[PDB]
Amino acid sequence: AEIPLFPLSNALFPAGVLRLRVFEIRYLDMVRRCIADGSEFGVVVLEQGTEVRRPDGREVLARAGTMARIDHWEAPMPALLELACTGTGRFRLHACTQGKYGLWTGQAEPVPDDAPLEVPPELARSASALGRLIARLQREGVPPHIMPMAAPFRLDDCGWVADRWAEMLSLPPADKARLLLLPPLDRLREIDAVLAADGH
Amino acid sequence: AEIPLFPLSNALFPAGVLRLRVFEIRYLDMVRRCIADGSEFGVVVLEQGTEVRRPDGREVLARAGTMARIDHWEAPMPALLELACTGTGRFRLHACTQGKYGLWTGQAEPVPDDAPLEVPPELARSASALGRLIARLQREGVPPHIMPMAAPFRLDDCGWVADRWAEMLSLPPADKARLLLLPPLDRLREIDAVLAA
Numbered sequence: 171a172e173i174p175l176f177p178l179s180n181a182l183f184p185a186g187v188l189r190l191r192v193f194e195i196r197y198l199d200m201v202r203r204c205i206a207d208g209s210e211f212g213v214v215v216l217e218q219g220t221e222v223r224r225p226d227g228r229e230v231l232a233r234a235g236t237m238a239r240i241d242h243w244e245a246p247m248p249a250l251l252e253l254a255c256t257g258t259g260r261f262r263l264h265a266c267t268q269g270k271y272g273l274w275t276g277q278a279e280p281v282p283d284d285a286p287l288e289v290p291p292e293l294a295r296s297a298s299a300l301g302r303l304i305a306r307l308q309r310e311g312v313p314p315h316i317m318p319m320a321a322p323f324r325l326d327d328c329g330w331v332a333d334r335w336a337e338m339l340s341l342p343p344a345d346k347a348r349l350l351l352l353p354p355l356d357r358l359r360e361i362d363a364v365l366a367a368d369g370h
Numbered sequence: 371a372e373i374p375l376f377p378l379s380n381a382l383f384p385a386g387v388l389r390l391r392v393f394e395i396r397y398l399d400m401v402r403r404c405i406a407d408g409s410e411f412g413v414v415v416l417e418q419g420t421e422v423r424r425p426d427g428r429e430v431l432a433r434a435g436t437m438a439r440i441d442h443w444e445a446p447m448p449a450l451l452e453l454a455c456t457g458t459g460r461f462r463l464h465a466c467t468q469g470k471y472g473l474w475t476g477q478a479e480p481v482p483d484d485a486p487l488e489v490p491p492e493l494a495r496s497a498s499a500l501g502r503l504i505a506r507l508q509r510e511g512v513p514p515h516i517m518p519m520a521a522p523f524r525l526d527d528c529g530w531v532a533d534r535w536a537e538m539l540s541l542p543p544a545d546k547a548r549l550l551l552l553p554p555l556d557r558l559r560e561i562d563a564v565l566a567a
């Protein structure tokens with residue numbers, strides 16, 4: 171499924187929050203199309219290279235990604251677009267090409283959402299930790315335009331909880347892409363093995 | 371104490387890495403002057419505002435921040451100013467003033483860099499977990515200009531450990547500001563509490 175690609179320094183996960191700020195011509199033209207078009211673009215983390223790369227070149231795109239849906243947009247100044255996208259359906263991009271203005275694109279086969287699971291008591295620490303984080307945000311009165319996570323607080327869900335943590339944890343891009351694809355349970359387990367002292 | 375301020379969505383901590391893209395020309399005069407005489411600018415996290423500039427809203431700065439040092443600027447894209455910075459000394463922001471063009475300026479009382487202290491056995495959890503994140507990024511050989519933290523990895527320094535977690539974790543801007551000025555021991559204890567409970 172040939173779709174436009176917006177590689178980024180961080181990976182996007184389903185239901186994930188993402189406030190973009192486009193200034194490059196390739197993304198300015200691409201984002202505007204999607205605005206009038208209605209379609210959404212694909213977001214995959216950069217396993218290598220930067221996200222601007224005007225003089226650069228060697229940039230490696232992750233093999234997995236999540237589709238990005240545009241919620242609302244604004245134009246604070248000319249040649250600048252401030253977006254507030256939401257992560258949608260995930261995909262497993264394969265052979266992609268780099269078109270005009272350096273706009274990445276690739277045929278990507280979607281990957282159906284995983285069935286919602288309950289968080290076992292063997293992984294309560296993470297879900298309880300996360301829940302603690304969200305509590306403070308709310309307790310402090312953090313406005314919507316700053317909240318790093320959407321309203322639907324699926325705290326009692328393996329996948330969801332792991333997606334939230336993988337989003338904010340400084341993990342290698344190559345790992346983030348794998349986590350996105352791995353099954354919900356396995357995903358929570360692994361991040362769990364990162365937050366807790368596995369090997370002291 | 372009077373210094374220029376650059377508000378950001380994320381708080382900046384000592385030794386914290388920062389890749390800043392400056393769009394609004396209202397800041398050009400600030401970054402240029404800094405680049406010129408090698409000075410620094412203050413970075414405070416926004417409590418109730420947008421990094422860019424809303425015409426219907428006003429920005430509210432946090433109670434503290436950290437000075438930023440320009441490791442070096444670049445302009446890969448025509449006229450786009452992109453610079454790598456590092457958080458240096460912390461300051462307590464007594465008062466700030468928003469003047470013309472929306473530029474912020476405040477009274478910054480610099481606070482001395484805390485002394486380093488070994489990580490106690492109970493707070494070891496927080497250090498080993500970070501240590502693993504770091505070793506994870508290295509095992510994958512993630513490029514330096516991609517890593518969120520800088521080379522000097524002080525895994526036995528409460529302040530360092532706590533600061534890293536504080537900039538990574540999704541916490542309200544006002545809390546980051548508070549933890550920033552908080553003494554090393556208390557900082558770690560507090561971030562440790564969030565990681566468990």
